């Protein structure tokens, strides 16, 4: 699926993400847009190492999905990779969760340094009523 923005700023606030350990939905927002375009089934194959990026959040196989074919993985969300190309976000959303729960943050993935740090991110919520 690919979310409209005001959509999915609703659909976020409602799973509980608007400052969760501290980040607000606008940086979510932020996030999703750079990482996939708000597309639930976007992946990345990085042949560099050989793992794959799922989904809304672009969620790394090396550390927190399984998928059987990244070498010397963890699964910490403890799911499928294939959970995290559903249109229905709710286990993409816990598992964001999770990744932000480690020392680093929103910091674990670099798209939102790139993109989003020290940004004004007010626009990617502004007029959609959360
Ligand atoms: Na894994």
């Given at each position: 699926?690919?979310?409209?923005?005001?959509?999915?700023?609703?659909?976020?606030?409602?799973?509980?993400?608007?400052?969760?350990?501290?980040?607000?939905?606008?940086?979510?927002?932020?996030?999703?847009?750079?990482?996939?375009?708000?597309?639930?089934?976007?992946?990345?194959?990085?042949?560099?190492?050989?793992?794959?990026?799922?989904?809304?959040?672009?969620?790394?196989?090396?550390?927190?999905?399984?998928?059987?074919?990244?070498?010397?993985?963890?699964?910490?969300?403890?799911?499928?990779?294939?959970?995290?190309?559903?249109?229905?976000?709710?286990?993409?959303?816990?598992?964001?969760?999770?990744?932000?729960?480690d020392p680093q943050g929103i910091?674990?993935?670099?798209?939102?340094?790139?993109?989003?740090?020290?940004?004004?991110?007010?626009?990617?919520?502004?007029?959609?009523?959360?």
């Amino acid at each position: 699926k690919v979310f409209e923005r005001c959509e999915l700023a609703r659909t976020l606030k409602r799973l509980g993400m608007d400052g969760y350990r501290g980040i607000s939905l606008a940086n979510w927002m932020c996030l999703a847009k750079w990482e996939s375009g708000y597309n639930t089934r976007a992946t990345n194959y990085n042949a560099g190492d050989r793992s794959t990026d799922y989904g809304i959040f672009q969620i790394n196989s090396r550390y927190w999905c399984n998928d059987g074919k990244t070498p010397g993985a963890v699964n910490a969300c403890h799911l499928s990779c294939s959970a995290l190309l559903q249109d229905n976000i709710a286990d993409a959303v816990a598992c964001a969760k999770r990744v932000v729960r480690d020392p680093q943050g929103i910091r674990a993935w670099v798209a939102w340094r790139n993109r989003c740090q020290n940004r004004d991110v007010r626009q990617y919520v502004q007029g959609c009523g959360v």
